[PDB]
């Protein structure tokens, strides 16, 4: 696919995804599984006013990936913008 066809396809698919996410369920269990298991994401930063998805990601990690993380020796740091701004910005207290 040429870049222009590729852009056309991406634009169409993204528009449809955003349009029908309006009226389709949010599959946050599956999305957490994707970037926690397949990607083995370590730094899970949630950008928001409250640590909502930080808490949900911590709950999912404890529920399902507690043994997986130990087996792979993977240390997952869940950060919230409203709480762990120092850690996200790498600005520890001198």
């Amino acid at each position: 696919m040429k870049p222009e066809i590729e852009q056309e396809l991406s634009h169409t698919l993204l528009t449809e995804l955003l349009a029908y996410q309006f009226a389709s369920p949010v599959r946050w269990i599956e999305t957490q599984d994707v970037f926690l298991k397949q990607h083995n994401t370590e730094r899970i930063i949630e950008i928001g006013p409250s640590p909502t998805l930080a808490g949900m990601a911590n709950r999912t990690i404890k529920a399902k990936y507690e043994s997986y993380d130990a087996a792979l020796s993977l240390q997952r740091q869940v950060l919230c913008y409203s709480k762990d701004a120092k850690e996200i910005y790498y600005k520890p207290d001198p």
Binding site: E66, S67, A70, A71, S73, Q75
Partner: protein, 319 residues
């Protein structure tokens, strides 16, 4: 083993010229730690024998029996087999070669890895010491330690299982395994451990938390574990090619694992000593369960050495 001995193994130069000593890490390295600890023990034995003015065999005749904790079994065998000064020198060289090969092949089989520094510094601040393949737990029963070991091992595969390595006493154990697994054990135990300085005088004993000293030992190999099982055959090949063996024991030298006297053993002394050093755990209570009124601790550490531990084990037994 020039690939393993970067800074060399010329202990005489290190003693005469302290500026030339390698760093603490290299000294604590197992290929260096084993033979040098053997040299320390043999030097202590020689100092005792020569200060009292007897030959090695003459001093040995005064000993009802001898034994050793981990690599000290080799020195115990040497003093058992030594009769004259020439025989003692031969046995000392044989043991030095044996422990050099043991350390070299153990390091080759299980190279010294570095744990992540967040975990290292967390352990250091917690007081658990630097992570290492050996973790000393105290003040806990075998049942309790076994329960925590299951809690840790259920989350890990076979190749990273933790195993009991040194049953030093009722309230003194050492666990051997990956340093990451031992750190996980330490964190679990901390979660189930008393806070530092908690006042529990007015608390029921069954509801009292745990008071224990979980600390990583300064040993860089998982001694007495399946992780070093493959090194046994290599060490056997080394000793058979170099013609190293012990013979003519004149006092009992009791095994660390099954407690059997080495004089009655039919299989090669060096084969069995290597197998205990690498694979079988150490039942120190069973090894030292025999009669003794006076015990001489020749190992390193002095106050922190094996002698005080044996005193705690045998307190009020007349030893």
């Amino acid at each position: 083993f020039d690939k393993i001995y970067t800074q060399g193994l010329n202990i005489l130069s290190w003693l005469k010229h302290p500026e030339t000593t390698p760093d603490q890490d290299y000294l604590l390295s197992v290929p260096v730690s084993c033979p040098v600890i053997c040299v320390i023990q043999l030097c202590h034995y020689t100092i005792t024998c020569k200060v009292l003015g007897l030959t090695p065999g003459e001093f040995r005749n005064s000993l009802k029996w001898s034994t050793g904790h981990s690599q000290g079994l080799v020195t115990a065998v040497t003093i058992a087999a030594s009769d004259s000064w020439d025989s003692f020198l031969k046995n000392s060289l044989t043991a030095v070669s044996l422990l050099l090969f043991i350390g070299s092949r153990c390091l080759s089989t299980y190279p010294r890895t570095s744990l992540p520094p967040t975990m290292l510094q967390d352990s250091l601040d917690n007081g658990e010491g630097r992570p290492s393949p050996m973790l000393s737990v105290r003040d806990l029963s075998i049942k309790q330690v076994e329960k925590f070991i299951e809690q840790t091992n259920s989350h890990l595969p076979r190749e990273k299982h933790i195993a009991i390595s040194l049953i030093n006493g009722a309230r003194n154990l050492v666990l051997s395994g990956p340093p990451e697994s031992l750190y996980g054990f330490n964190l679990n135990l901390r979660n189930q451990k008393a806070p530092m300085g908690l006042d529990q005088s007015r608390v029921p004993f069954s509801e009292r938390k745990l008071k224990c000293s979980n600390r990583f030992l300064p040993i860089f190999a998982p001694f007495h574990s399946h992780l070093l099982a493959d090194a046994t055959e290599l060490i056997l090949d080394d000793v058979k090619e170099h013609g190293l063996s012990f013979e003519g024991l004149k006092i009992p030298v009791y095994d660390t694992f099954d407690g059997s006297d080495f004089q009655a053993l039919k299989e090669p002394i060096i084969d069995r000593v290597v197998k205990l050093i690498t694979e079988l755990p150490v039942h120190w209570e069973e090894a030292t369960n025999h009669k003794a009124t006076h015990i001489l601790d020749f190992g390193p550490g002095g106050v922190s050495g094996l002698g005080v531990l044996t005193h705690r084990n045998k307190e009020g037994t007349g030893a």
